[PDB]
Structure formats: structure tokens, C-alpha cells
Amino acid sequence: GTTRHVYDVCDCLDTLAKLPDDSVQLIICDPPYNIMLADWDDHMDYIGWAKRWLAEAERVLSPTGSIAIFGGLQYQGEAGSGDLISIISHMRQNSKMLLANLIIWNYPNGMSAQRFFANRHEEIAWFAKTKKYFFDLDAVREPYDEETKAAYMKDKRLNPESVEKGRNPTNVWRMSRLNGNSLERVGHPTQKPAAVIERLVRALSHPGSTVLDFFAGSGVTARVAIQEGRNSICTDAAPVFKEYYQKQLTFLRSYEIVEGAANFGAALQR
Ligand SMILES: CSC[C@H]1O[C@@H](n2cnc3c(N)ncnc32)[C@H](O)[C@@H]1O
């Protein structure tokens, strides 16, 4: 079972336009939260732009597919920008997708603050295309230690099978962000840690399915896809993305890498 991975440098809408309906199982989405100067030629706000790829994202997702959207809740009101709430409010009015979960990524370290509570969180909005979305909870359960696992086993009030499988990790994930010394770092300023992406890939996609990321950034999605046995399509508008993607590979089982949007199909084949 060899997996295929395609990558390229191009705009997110050009990527989405080349993918057929219901062909992707999971989309990893960590988008820019501000439009470009030139975007003022056709839009008057952030959602005017974002709604285009949000609609395409839903179109390419299969009936059992999902999209995980990273974002914060600190939008300051600047024209042309927004946050995760801007997207959620838009989705509530115009999309039939279901918000399966609003996950809180609670990281340990951060900047200090004297005039407010120091920020230690980022959100992940998990939208499912339909009520029949795929979910592999057991693949992400957190096991109990032998001592606790034995303590619950003796409690006949509890189902032993549930004890054996582990606990639901909940919708609050306490995971560290990458540090300036991390081995995963490739140079991208907002690089996401593999651990967070791994949990999303394991729980929201099945082995051999396609994971898509059109704001690929560091290319961490491809590295995780490969390690987890999924196929992937990763694109980014920045030329430097190719360099990052190649670096992710060095960090790395049968898989094939293919460059070029003309080859997206290689990663869509089941
Ligand atoms: C994961 S950080 C967000 C990423 O989105 C990329 N990006 C910004 N605007 C676009 C766009 N219109 N199409 C594709 N990628 C984009 C940026 O280059 C960055 O690496």
C-alpha cells in the first residue's frame, strides 16, 4: 500500500478548481486572516475573499469528509482582516456543514501581559460535510497508566473495554507549539507542530484517503500524511514552499512524491 503525495506552488483557488467534487476526505486549513492589497479590487472584507475557497473546500470534500480550520478569536476590526469567528459566522449563515467540534489548542508557553490575561490558546473549527462524517476516536484515545488502568478494571461500574481503549482526548488539547530549537522547524514563521496535525489526520481521515492542504506553509501536512499512511495534496502560493516541502521529506514505508498541479490525480486515486 504505497501512498502518493503531490505538491506545487499556486493560489488556493487554482488548486481547488482542479479537484473534482467529493474527491477529498480531509482538509487541513490554516489560512491567512487578511486579504492582499490587490484583493481590494474585488472584495470589501475578509469573508468576501474567504467564502470563495470555503465554498470550494466543501465542494471537494466527500460526503464523509471534514475540514479542520485553525484560527483565533482576537480579531481587532481592521478592514480586510478577520478571525475564526468571521468564518464560523459565515458558515452558520451559508453552509450546511456541521460544526462537529470547536477545539481549543492550549499551549504552555507564550508572551507575558500586564494589562490582560496572557494568551495561551488557538482554536480549531472542525466542520463535517454531513452527519455521516468519518471519525476514528480509538485512533486518538489517550491510554491510562498500568496503575490507573488496573484501578478502573476492578471497578465493575465501568466498562472494561472502554478502559482498555483509553480516554477521549476531549476538545481541549494541551500541546506545545514549536520552539526556535525544534527539530521539525524548516524556517516557516507559523509552522504547526506535527503532533497537532497527527491527531486531526488520525481521527478525521481513514488510511489511504486523501488529505488536502491549500495553505500548506511548511508542508507539515504532507510529512504527517506520509507517516500516517494517507495520500496528500499540498499547495501554497509562496515559492519558498517548495524548499520547505523538500525539507520535510528529509525529516522522513512506501510513498511516492510528485511535483505539479497537473498531477493532483496521483493523490486522489484511492
Ligand atoms: C500555514 S500559514 C498560511 C499560508 O498560506 C499561504 N497563502 C496566503 N494567501 C494564499 C493564497 N491566496 N493561496 C494559497 N496560499 C496562500 C501563505 O503563503 C502561507 O504559507
Side-chain angles (χ1 to χ4, degrees):
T2 86
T3 54
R4 310 301 165 60
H5 306 269
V6 186
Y7 74 99
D8 204 1
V9 174
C10 60
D11 180 272
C12 67
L13 294 179
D14 283 351
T15 286
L16 288 156
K18 300 182 182 185
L19 299 173
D21 294 6
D22 312 313
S23 62
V24 183
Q25 172 51 41
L26 168 70
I27 292 173
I28 295 298
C29 187
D30 179 23
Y33 275 105
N34 70 284
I35 64 182
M36 300 300 96
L37 222 210
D39 288 315
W40 284 112
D41 295 327
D42 298 301
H43 312 95
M44 65 169 264
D45 55 19
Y46 176 72
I47 295 298
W49 170 67
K51 76 187 191 313
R52 303 194 64 187
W53 52 262
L54 285 162
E56 283 285 277
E58 193 183 328
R59 178 185 65 72
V60 303
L61 280 176
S62 73
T64 60
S66 296
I67 179 174
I69 310 177
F70 288 75
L73 313 171
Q74 306 179 300
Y75 173 57
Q76 302 294 288
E78 309 100 306
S81 296
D83 65 10
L84 193 57
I85 284 179
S86 305
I87 293 179
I88 296 174
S89 289
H90 167 73
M91 295 296 275
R92 289 179 176 181
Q93 170 73 198
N94 303 293
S95 177
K96 286 305 182 305
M97 290 190 90
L98 305 307
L99 181 58
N101 269 132
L102 190 295
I103 299 160
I104 303 303
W105 174 12
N106 176 205
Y107 43 88
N109 303 167
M111 299 175 267
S112 56
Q114 304 307 305
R115 285 286 289 163
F116 56 78
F117 300 99
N119 179 52
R120 294 290 183 280
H121 71 86
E122 194 184 323
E123 287 56 60
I124 302 172
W126 162 29
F127 280 98
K129 187 165 182 177
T130 77
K131 56 304 292 95
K132 312 95 63 180
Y133 61 80
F134 175 77
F135 192 62
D136 188 351
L137 180 54
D138 297 343
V140 295
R141 283 174 183 284
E142 304 175 313
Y144 304 97
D145 54 67
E146 291 306 304
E147 284 68 11
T148 302
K149 192 174 184 180
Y152 285 179
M153 222 59 92
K154 63 187 300 177
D155 199 324
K156 302 306 173 185
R157 291 176 300 189
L158 309 174
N159 174 300
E161 295 185 60
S162 304
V163 175
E164 174 65 18
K165 294 184 173 187
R167 62 172 181 294
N168 190 305
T170 82
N171 63 356
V172 180
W173 306 347
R174 298 182 62 277
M175 309 175 79
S176 312
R177 296 177 297 183
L178 299 186
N179 59 69
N181 306 300
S182 177
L183 296 167
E184 311 185 13
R185 187 163 297 300
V186 299
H188 201 279
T190 55
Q191 189 176 329
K192 297 174 290 300
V196 180
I197 304 305
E198 298 181 324
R199 180 164 286 178
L200 289 171
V201 171
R202 293 174 177 167
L204 310 182
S205 76
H206 43 105
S209 66
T210 306
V211 178
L212 165 70
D213 188 341
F214 43 78
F215 292 126
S218 71
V220 59
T221 293
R223 175 184 152 210
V224 173
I226 290 171
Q227 296 179 172
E228 298 305 315
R230 272 70 168 169
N231 296 314
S232 76
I233 292 171
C234 293
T235 65
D236 193 281
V240 63
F241 166 60
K242 180 173 183 174
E243 294 176 54
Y244 295 143
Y245 191 97
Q246 297 178 305
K247 301 308 99 64
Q248 291 295 338
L249 297 184
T250 70
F251 293 170
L252 295 168
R253 198 153 64 190
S254 183
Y255 60 102
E256 181 184 6
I257 304 302
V258 182
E259 184 182 14
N263 300 297
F264 287 151
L268 293 176
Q269 193 179 330
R270 301 152 195 167

